[PDB]
Motif scaffolding. Sequence first.
Motif, PDB file in Angstrom:
ATOM      1  N   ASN B 157       0.847  -1.178   0.000  1.00 11.71           N
ATOM      2  CA  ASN B 157       0.000   0.000   0.000  1.00 11.71           C
ATOM      3  C   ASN B 157       0.887   1.234   0.000  1.00 11.71           C
ATOM      4  OD1 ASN B 157      -1.528   2.280   1.488  1.00 11.71           O
ATOM      5  ND2 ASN B 157      -3.157   0.787   1.032  1.00 11.71           N
ATOM      6  N   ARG B 158       0.644   2.140  -0.938  1.00 16.22           N
ATOM      7  CA  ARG B 158       1.431   3.372  -1.065  1.00 16.22           C
ATOM      8  C   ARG B 158       1.323   4.378   0.058  1.00 16.22           C
ATOM      9  NH1 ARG B 158       0.122   3.367  -6.588  1.00 16.22           N
ATOM     10  NH2 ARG B 158       1.927   2.784  -7.905  1.00 16.22           N
ATOM     11  N   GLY B 163       3.254  -0.793   8.171  1.00 12.59           N
ATOM     12  CA  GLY B 163       3.272  -2.192   7.798  1.00 12.59           C
ATOM     13  C   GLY B 163       4.691  -2.744   7.760  1.00 12.59           C
ATOM     14  N   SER B 164       4.813  -4.056   7.582  1.00 18.83           N
ATOM     15  CA  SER B 164       6.121  -4.688   7.507  1.00 18.83           C
ATOM     16  C   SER B 164       6.631  -4.556   6.078  1.00 18.83           C
ATOM     17  CB  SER B 164       6.014  -6.163   7.915  1.00 18.83           C
ATOM     18  OG  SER B 164       4.876  -6.780   7.334  1.00 18.83           O
ATOM     19  N   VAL B 165       7.938  -4.665   5.899  1.00 18.25           N
ATOM     20  CA  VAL B 165       8.523  -4.560   4.576  1.00 18.25           C
ATOM     21  C   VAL B 165       9.630  -5.593   4.410  1.00 18.25           C
ATOM     22  CG1 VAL B 165       9.947  -3.119   3.085  1.00 18.25           C
ATOM     23  CG2 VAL B 165       7.952  -2.159   4.187  1.00 18.25           C
ATOM     24  N   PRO B 166       9.665  -6.284   3.253  1.00 18.94           N
ATOM     25  CA  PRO B 166      10.674  -7.306   2.955  1.00 18.94           C
ATOM     26  C   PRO B 166      12.067  -6.718   3.074  1.00 18.94           C
ATOM     27  CG  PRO B 166       8.887  -7.509   1.456  1.00 18.94           C
ATOM     28  CD  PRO B 166       8.701  -6.183   2.147  1.00 18.94           C
ATOM     29  N   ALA B 184      -2.521  -5.490   6.232  1.00 18.49           N
ATOM     30  CA  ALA B 184      -3.230  -6.764   6.319  1.00 18.49           C
ATOM     31  C   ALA B 184      -4.626  -6.678   5.715  1.00 18.49           C
ATOM     32  CB  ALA B 184      -3.320  -7.221   7.757  1.00 18.49           C
ATOM     33  N   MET B 185      -4.956  -5.501   5.185  1.00 18.33           N
ATOM     34  CA  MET B 185      -6.268  -5.270   4.574  1.00 18.33           C
ATOM     35  C   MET B 185      -6.320  -5.433   3.057  1.00 18.33           C
ATOM     36  SD  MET B 185      -8.914  -2.123   4.788  1.00 18.33           S
ATOM     37  CE  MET B 185      -8.161  -0.731   3.951  1.00 18.33           C
ATOM     38  N   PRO B 186      -6.850  -6.570   2.578  1.00 20.58           N
ATOM     39  CA  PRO B 186      -6.927  -6.759   1.126  1.00 20.58           C
ATOM     40  C   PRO B 186      -7.708  -5.608   0.499  1.00 20.58           C
ATOM     41  CG  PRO B 186      -8.391  -8.246   2.296  1.00 20.58           C
ATOM     42  CD  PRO B 186      -7.426  -7.718   3.301  1.00 20.58           C
ATOM     43  N   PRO B 187      -7.253  -5.116  -0.664  1.00 21.97           N
ATOM     44  CA  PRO B 187      -7.916  -4.008  -1.360  1.00 21.97           C
ATOM     45  C   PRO B 187      -9.399  -4.240  -1.259  1.00 21.97           C
ATOM     46  CG  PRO B 187      -6.026  -4.651  -2.561  1.00 21.97           C
ATOM     47  CD  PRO B 187      -6.227  -5.726  -1.519  1.00 21.97           C
ATOM     48  N   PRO B 188     -10.118  -3.239  -0.764  1.00 22.99           N
ATOM     49  CA  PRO B 188     -11.561  -3.263  -0.557  1.00 22.99           C
ATOM     50  C   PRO B 188     -12.425  -2.738  -1.694  1.00 22.99           C
ATOM     51  CG  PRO B 188     -10.718  -1.266   0.356  1.00 22.99           C
ATOM     52  CD  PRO B 188      -9.559  -1.928  -0.400  1.00 22.99           C
ATOM     53  N   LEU B 189     -11.933  -1.735  -2.407  1.00 24.74           N
ATOM     54  CA  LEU B 189     -12.717  -1.197  -3.492  1.00 24.74           C
ATOM     55  C   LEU B 189     -12.530  -1.967  -4.794  1.00 24.74           C
ATOM     56  CD1 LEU B 189     -13.108   2.552  -2.750  1.00 24.74           C
ATOM     57  CD2 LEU B 189     -14.103   0.452  -1.823  1.00 24.74           C
ATOM     58  N   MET B 190     -13.163  -1.449  -5.843  1.00 25.61           N
ATOM     59  CA  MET B 190     -13.164  -2.047  -7.172  1.00 25.61           C
ATOM     60  C   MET B 190     -14.238  -1.272  -7.926  1.00 25.61           C
ATOM     61  SD  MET B 190     -13.817  -5.976  -7.945  1.00 25.61           S
ATOM     62  CE  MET B 190     -15.549  -6.117  -7.523  1.00 25.61           C
ATOM     63  N   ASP B 191     -13.852  -0.545  -8.965  1.00 15.40           N
ATOM     64  CA  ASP B 191     -14.816   0.264  -9.711  1.00 15.40           C
ATOM     65  C   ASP B 191     -16.237  -0.300  -9.775  1.00 15.40           C
ATOM     66  OD1 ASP B 191     -12.082   1.148 -10.630  1.00 15.40           O
ATOM     67  OD2 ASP B 191     -13.330   2.568 -11.762  1.00 15.40           O
TER      68      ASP B 191
ATOM     69  N   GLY E 131       9.464  -7.815  16.187  1.00 19.06           N
ATOM     70  CA  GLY E 131       9.516  -8.182  14.785  1.00 19.06           C
ATOM     71  C   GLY E 131      10.870  -7.830  14.217  1.00 19.06           C
ATOM     72  N   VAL E 132      11.919  -8.169  14.966  1.00 13.90           N
ATOM     73  CA  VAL E 132      13.262  -7.861  14.516  1.00 13.90           C
ATOM     74  C   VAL E 132      13.333  -6.367  14.162  1.00 13.90           C
ATOM     75  CG1 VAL E 132      14.888  -8.222  12.631  1.00 13.90           C
ATOM     76  CG2 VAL E 132      13.799 -10.201  13.749  1.00 13.90           C
ATOM     77  N   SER E 133      13.424  -5.536  15.203  1.00 10.87           N
ATOM     78  CA  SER E 133      13.475  -4.087  15.056  1.00 10.87           C
ATOM     79  C   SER E 133      14.608  -3.443  15.838  1.00 10.87           C
ATOM     80  CB  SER E 133      12.156  -3.468  15.511  1.00 10.87           C
ATOM     81  OG  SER E 133      11.067  -3.974  14.757  1.00 10.87           O
ATOM     82  N   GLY E 134      15.137  -2.365  15.279  1.00  4.09           N
ATOM     83  CA  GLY E 134      16.225  -1.675  15.930  1.00  4.09           C
ATOM     84  C   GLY E 134      17.586  -2.087  15.405  1.00  4.09           C
ATOM     85  N   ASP E 135      18.587  -1.328  15.824  1.00  6.32           N
ATOM     86  CA  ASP E 135      19.941  -1.577  15.400  1.00  6.32           C
ATOM     87  C   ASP E 135      20.485  -2.963  15.673  1.00  6.32           C
ATOM     88  OD1 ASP E 135      19.989   1.035  14.479  1.00  6.32           O
ATOM     89  OD2 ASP E 135      20.926   1.801  16.330  1.00  6.32           O
ATOM     90  N   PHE E 136      19.767  -3.803  16.416  1.00  4.13           N
ATOM     91  CA  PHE E 136      20.309  -5.120  16.739  1.00  4.13           C
ATOM     92  C   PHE E 136      19.468  -6.339  16.499  1.00  4.13           C
ATOM     93  CE2 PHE E 136      23.939  -3.407  19.176  1.00  4.13           C
ATOM     94  CZ  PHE E 136      23.544  -2.077  19.144  1.00  4.13           C
ATOM     95  N   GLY E 137      18.562  -6.235  15.540  1.00  2.30           N
ATOM     96  CA  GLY E 137      17.726  -7.373  15.223  1.00  2.30           C
ATOM     97  C   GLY E 137      16.901  -7.863  16.393  1.00  2.30           C
TER      98      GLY E 137
END
Lengths: 256, 256, 428, 428, 179, 179
Positions: B157-158, B163-166, B184-191, E131-137
């Motif tokens: 989500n922009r 949220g978490s990030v890889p 964790a919220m699947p896109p809700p809208l849709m034209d 959730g593995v956060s901060g300078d030290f995992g």
Amino acid sequence: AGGGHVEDVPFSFEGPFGTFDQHQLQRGLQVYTEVCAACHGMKFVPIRSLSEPGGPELPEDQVRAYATQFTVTDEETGEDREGKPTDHFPHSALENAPDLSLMAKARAGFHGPMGTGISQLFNGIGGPEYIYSVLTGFPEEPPKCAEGHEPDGFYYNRAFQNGSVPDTCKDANGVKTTAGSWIAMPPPLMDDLVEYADGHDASVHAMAEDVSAFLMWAAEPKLMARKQAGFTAVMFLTVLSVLLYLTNKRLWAGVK
Amino acid sequence: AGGGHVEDVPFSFEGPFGTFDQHQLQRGLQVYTEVCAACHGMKFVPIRSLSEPGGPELPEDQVRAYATQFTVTDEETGEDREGKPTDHFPHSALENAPDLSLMAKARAGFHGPMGTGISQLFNGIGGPEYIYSVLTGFPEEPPKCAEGHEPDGFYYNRAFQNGSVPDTCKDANGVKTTAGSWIAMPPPLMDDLVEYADGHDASVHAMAEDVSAFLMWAAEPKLMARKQAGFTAVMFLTVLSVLLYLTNKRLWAGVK
Amino acid sequence: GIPHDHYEPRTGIEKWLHSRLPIVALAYDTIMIPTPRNLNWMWIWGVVLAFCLVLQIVTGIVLAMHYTPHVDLAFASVEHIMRNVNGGFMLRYLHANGASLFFIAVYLHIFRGLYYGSYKAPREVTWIVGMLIYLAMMATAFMGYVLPWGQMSFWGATVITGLFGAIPGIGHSIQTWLLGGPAVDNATLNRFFSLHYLLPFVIAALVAIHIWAFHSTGNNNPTGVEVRRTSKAEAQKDTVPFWPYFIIKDVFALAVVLLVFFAIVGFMPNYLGHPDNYIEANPLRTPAHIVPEWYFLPFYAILRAFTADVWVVQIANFISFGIIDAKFFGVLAMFGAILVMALVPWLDTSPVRSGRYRPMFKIYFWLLAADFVILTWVGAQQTTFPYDWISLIASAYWFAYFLVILPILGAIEKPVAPPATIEEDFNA
Amino acid sequence: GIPHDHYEPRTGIEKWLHSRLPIVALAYDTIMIPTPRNLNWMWIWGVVLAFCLVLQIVTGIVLAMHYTPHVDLAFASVEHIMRNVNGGFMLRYLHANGASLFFIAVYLHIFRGLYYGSYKAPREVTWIVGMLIYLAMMATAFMGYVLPWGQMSFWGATVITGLFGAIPGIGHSIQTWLLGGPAVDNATLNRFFSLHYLLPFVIAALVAIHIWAFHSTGNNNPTGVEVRRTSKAEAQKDTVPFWPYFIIKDVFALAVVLLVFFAIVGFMPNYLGHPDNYIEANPLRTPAHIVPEWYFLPFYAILRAFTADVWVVQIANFISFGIIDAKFFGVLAMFGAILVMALVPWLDTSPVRSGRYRPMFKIYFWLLAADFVILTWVGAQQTTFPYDWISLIASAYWFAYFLVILPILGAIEKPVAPPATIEEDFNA
Amino acid sequence: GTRRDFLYYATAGAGAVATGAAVWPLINQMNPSADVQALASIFVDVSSVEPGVQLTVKFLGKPIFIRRRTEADIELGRSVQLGQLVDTNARNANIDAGAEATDQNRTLDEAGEWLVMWGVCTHLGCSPIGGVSGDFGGWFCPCHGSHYDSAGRIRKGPAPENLPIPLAKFIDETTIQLG
Amino acid sequence: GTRRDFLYYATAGAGAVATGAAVWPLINQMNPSADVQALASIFVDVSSVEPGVQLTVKFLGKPIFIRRRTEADIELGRSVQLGQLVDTNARNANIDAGAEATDQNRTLDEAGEWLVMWGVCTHLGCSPIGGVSGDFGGWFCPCHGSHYDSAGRIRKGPAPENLPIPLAKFIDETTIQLG
Ligand code: HEM
Ligand code: HEM
Ligand code: HEM
Ligand code: HEM
Ligand code: HEM
Ligand SMILES: C/C=C(C)/C=C/C=C/[C@H](OC)[C@@H](C)[C@@H](OC)[C@@H](C)CCc1oc2c(O)c(OC)cc(OC)c2c(=O)c1C
Ligand SMILES: C/C=C(C)/C=C/C=C/[C@H](OC)[C@@H](C)[C@@H](OC)[C@@H](C)CCc1oc2c(O)c(OC)cc(OC)c2c(=O)c1C
Ligand SMILES: CCCCCCCCO[C@@H]1[C@@H](O)[C@H](O)[C@@H](CO)O[C@H]1O
Ligand code: FES
Ligand code: FES
Ligand SMILES: [Sr+2]
Ligand SMILES: [Sr+2]
């Protein structure tokens, strides 16, 4: 309604030096559980108090075990589970059965004389006695005046004073004739309806006497504490008074 | 976490002379009901407010009818029943879906500059916008950097910033590369997922814009009242000030 | 102690009343006191404060009539007020923004004092009492914020009760006591309500004495020069009766202020506050953007500048055999930063009252102000670089000013010539 | 207005303090006032009252920390305090019996005054203020009783809010307002909490002035004869310094009182109260034995004496074209019974201060007392005969005393000779 | 002489005694009520916990972290040398009070997969973001910027100790008994 | 002259205006909140009601009596000259506001079986005792001793009116709609 007669039972806890009787309270708890609990409840009494000092004082394990018989909707879960000592006994089972949590403080048995409350002043409020009496107060045969008018579902009781009474038992002015009235509580006691471990007699007379005392504690758990606090306070002051008295006399003596 | 970008939507209610748009709010309520309500709730919003002035202002009958869809659990009864306008919408259906009652207020979209909050000072907190953005913010294709590491169950989500990030998208210091993050919220809208009565366009863009405005009201129902109170207070004072000023100037003029 | 003219009964009711309870006399002497003619706008803050106190108390009592101090209800309790009570929404917002106004005022009130030597003898008592108020206010304001029982509310409480856990030895005890348990819970909330109510009256009481005291020494003016106490004649030359002269500009100003105040409460009530408190309190989650109330930021800044990596902290830690670690140092640093300010009547050695006539002083003073602002600004930033540093220098300068600069400047400074009389300045 | 001499700083700290804030001076002048030597045991009640005020406030604030003002919790809230809070049981009981002690005191305080002309000039203001306190106290005491939310609590509230519904015209408005709704509910409870808190402080404030006033006229003594104000010499003959002479007597008495007080709170805490309040409040049932708080009984008696069958009522109903029916009459009768007592400084025309020297007065006075007792006694009885009558005569005599007897006795009575000086009496 | 003076001092004495007897209870009432003093022992089903997941649970009113660590996590923990740590003590109630902050002394199992500890920053109180956060995992406490490593040890900031580990143990296969 | 005096009076004027604008809301806040103002209309199943039985129900926070009268009850009600009643008005919302306290105007049915009214003593508020109590075979309010007859009319005491009858009607065969 009005006021009535109540057998004056000499409970162990009355008087400034009165204290509960651990065993009695215990017996009581048994009566409450085996008989009363069926319809009544004690929603303000935390089970774990069964353990606290100055009352039945049961071993935490027993308590923990006892608490297991109840089933309680768990706060978060919403599902059910065995009872923990951190739970209060349950609400009355029987919709119109009152909660016995504060009964013994919620009833007066000694009134007057002349509406001067001087009778309470020396005998106390008499809640436990009243309770006692009510339990004792179920006679076998209804009073004659209402020999064919007993409302259905009710039972005459010598001590209960707020029940309904058959017109056939009211005087020229509507006042009742009967000592008591009709209660919605079917006689609960019955000689030896409970088996006391140590074999103590289970005469309806006893049970009532006990369960009352129990119910007295149930409602005033911190009684003893309160009274101990008493002596103390009095002592400080009685002394402090004498001292302050002299102190005063002496100081004023120097003017007249 | 941190802060991010939010599309600056020109809502009707912004500005000291801003006021809700009755129809929009209505459209919104439809979106909320037909889509959002599925997972979210509004536990602090009494349905009957749908009627009150300064908001959607729906006819009591419709409201009463609307309230019917909800399967409430009666206060005494314990059983179930239809919903009455005297009931609040229900709690979020989906365990981890937040309550939207105060959402339009529990979020800021305009931050800084330099952490000086001067951006809020002229654009407002931006809660509705943020909400808007979040709805708008689901892109078709994940940002490159996490081309093969999208956590299962979440969605990029922009606008969402907590949220978490890889790992594959964090710089040399753990900071995130992506504008947004995984929600964790699947896109809700849709034209055209909702058929507006009057035929208004149901472009995902619109719906979001509306439901937001609705959610803004949902959280600040007394907005207009507040502002009207405003002018008033200012007026009294602006005047009272001028008067008091002269009064002062004249009194002091008589000394220096 | 100035030459004025006392109260004399006119109406019969008055004579009757006066011979029994001269309460009207008192009010007179209180509202009639001769006051320096030169007083500028920096003297209105006292009243602005007064107003705030009343505002807060009435709106408070009112709110108290709808609020429910108990976790399960508390928050709902407040939204209820917002959505249901008649004008509830406007009352809530007024009470809250009332607090900000309340502080914005005291800081101006305080700094005004620091700059004009209003704490300098004989005005010492005034200053101390004022400090007491300052403390009380904060204490209050804190508990208040707790009530709504939202995110910032819970955690904030968790942390502030924590400060006491920092005291060595007793500390844990003291903390458990405040919390009424192992964690911040209902018991805490409940007691805070009782105290949030109580304190304001205590404040009110002090405020009385505050006034009583500055009434016993006469007010201070921008020149630091006292009023001539030798003859009603010349005294009148230096002053004007409080009523109606000041009573009016007070009301005048009071209006202007309220104008802006209402503007805020009307148009941007949620500006000065934290969006996270519209989130119900959660015991298992601390919001990533948790930040204190702006009027606390500076003291917050200071407390967190001192991490286990600060040289002085370290030194300190070592020398104290570990007893004074970072944590406790930070706490000490904070309360200390306040405490020094209270001792200012004794750290400032210069015998020149008004700072308007202290060329060097003026420089460090404004740095102090700039600092306070900066300090606040940084409390709102992260613990990362360059902030950590900024905060450090900032905190540093703070103590620098009270513990060093002022004491020195007292002997070193070359003071300018203060006018001979207030009259003289006024006419200018 | 008696001659004496004021505090004078000795220690340096004192001389330093005094030049800035003479707060120590004030305390002195307050604790050193010359007081008639003859004062007897009927003057201790003032302090017994003081104590009660504090006792109530501290135990109150404490209780407030555990109480939950909200129907669903409120009652449980209190049992909780009883069964769980440390010494909760003893605090609850103390606060409650505290109220009784508090009243027992004021009645003694009040009657003491009526008998000794302590309300007759110049002590008028004192008296009035005192009345304000009296009202406030009751006001308070009522709301307090509501809090536990038990049977007597609910209904009692229902009824007292009702009194306002009795006012013609506005009456229903005023009542809905107090209740915050169509019936006594949460909204009511909640606002009562906020007010039960608030009032005591207001009381405290008045009590200040109360003292301030009797301090401005000097205390009254059993002889009604003032202190000689011509020379420090003879004045000392009539008085002794408050400290330590009385300060001790006060403490002494204070002890004896508390001895008995604690005896009650320790051994029979539930004596003075209604067993029905240990019953959770029920909106659908009024206990058959509902009775007000003994300290209210007399005024209650009066109110219910006037039924639609009372002649005066009828006359009244007639003359007023219905507007003043029984209901409203009863209400008027009650507040009136109090109001007259407030006007007593003006209904008593006799110029002899002490009632010790009014042979006829004595008689009606003691009847008044006897009446007050009787009045109380009957409020506890039923509305049936002979009570209805008794209450009637009783109420009748009450107004009789203030509106008629006193006024008359003023011209008719032949007063005895009051000593020439307090000294004279003291020595005796 | 000291006849009257004795009395005066015996009096003021009793006075003080009483005075305090009053003060104490006014104070003590604030201490934990008998209901709060019901220190339970909860049970946590941990079957649905894959590695890399933290389980946050309430207990005694405060949060408790239960993380099933990844290899990545367990690695770093064991890399670090006692003397690089800010706190040396394991702060573990399950083991000796003298133990050392070795990653092995911070877990419940020998494999070092089960890290259980109070999610209560030792600085002022917050629950540190995991959730593995901060300078030290590890975890990062946003209240005053304190960093903890993958073993829950303080490594940076004002915090002065490693997150405490409460009495805990597996009661069976998929259940831990905190308390 | 009145140049400055005008100003002074135009000023004090605005002052007062504002002052009140403040006071009002401080007062009004106590009035019924928007949630209270939700005057519903309840429904009462009265099937399980034999004659001689009173049904007490809550409504708008006040009790409501629903008695199915006996013949004995209905008799006495009709056996009273209106001129003997203290209140003449029927106090019945279902019928005209001018109606007369005839037992017939106090019931819902023509047989007089169904007496429905607010169990709220008109004196000060209490809920009068039922079960045919009093001096007029009705209800007795223990708060100040007011008597009501079998039709709910005040006959003795401070009470100045007969118990009011609220909008009510049988919606069907065994159900009444109060409100
Ligand atoms: C020995 C155990 C019991 C004790 C100590 C006990 C005690 C009491 C007391 C003190 C009262 C209230 C008296 C008053 O209103 O002043 C009462 C009422 C009542 N009890 Fe129990 N009870 C017991 C067993 C039972 C049982 C087993 C039932 C259910 C079969 C029951 C049903 C009721 C009912 C329905 C009432 C209220 C009826 C009325 O108000 O007339 N009781 N009981
Ligand atoms: C120095 C005087 C006072 C200050 C600085 C103060 C400050 C505050 C603050 C900052 C809040 C939180 C605002 C929010 O919800 O975001 C608050 C809430 C509250 N205050 Fe006060 N307060 C004061 C006096 C009072 C008094 C005297 C009462 C009781 C008579 C009171 C009752 C309340 C209540 C019930 C709340 C909770 C509802 C609310 O937050 O708006 N306050 N107060
Ligand atoms: C309840 C908040 C307070 C109120 C209502 C209050 C009110 C006042 C007022 C009305 C004055 C006289 C006019 C003026 O010069 O401002 C005054 C003076 C002063 N205040 Fe405050 N004040 C408060 C808090 C404080 C605080 C926090 C301090 C700083 C410790 C303080 C320090 C002073 C000083 C030093 C003066 C000068 C007195 C003199 O000239 O003799 N006040 N205050
Ligand atoms: C808050 C409860 C009250 C307190 C604390 C209080 C306290 C006092 C004190 C300490 C005194 C002086 C010593 C004494 O004679 O006991 C006093 C005197 C007096 N009080 Fe009160 N009082 C209270 C209520 C009342 C009330 C309700 C009245 C009746 C209107 C009243 C009327 C008086 C009068 C007339 C005096 C005599 C003063 C004189 O001799 O000039 N007081 N009170
Ligand atoms: C004039 C001093 C006061 C009087 C005469 C007074 C009287 C009362 C009374 C009669 C009750 C009911 C006691 C009972 O349960 O039988 C009560 C309860 C209570 N009062 Fe006070 N009160 C006073 C001051 C205070 C103060 C300053 C507070 C602090 C807000 C307070 C808080 C409470 C609370 C929370 C209760 C409910 C718990 C309970 O006592 O049952 N009171 N008060
Ligand atoms: C019954 C309990 C009592 C009497 C407690 C009294 C305490 C009194 C003090 O004032 C006298 C105290 C309020 C005062 O310290 C001087 C403040 C500047 C504390 C500053 C403060 O605020 C925070 C805050 O608001 C938070 O939430 C948004 C969160 C916080 O960390 C994340 C803090 C915080 O870290 C600090 C240091
Ligand atoms: C926000 C301010 C408010 C709401 C102020 C209210 C003030 C009220 C009055 O103070 C002036 C009031 C306390 C005072 O009247 C002088 C008392 C003598 C009232 C006497 C009183 O008590 C009763 C009571 O306690 C009950 O419960 C057990 C029940 C009652 O029915 C039987 C009564 C009652 O019938 C009466 C007349
Ligand atoms: C001056 C006052 C002296 C009071 C002495 C009181 C002795 C009270 O003795 C009472 C008993 O009468 C009562 O039955 C029980 C109930 O638990 O409690 C005791 O304290
Ligand atoms: S509480 Fe964790 S950094 Fe301060
Ligand atoms: S309220 Fe019914 S008799 Fe007074
Ligand atoms: Sr006995
Ligand atoms: Sr915009």
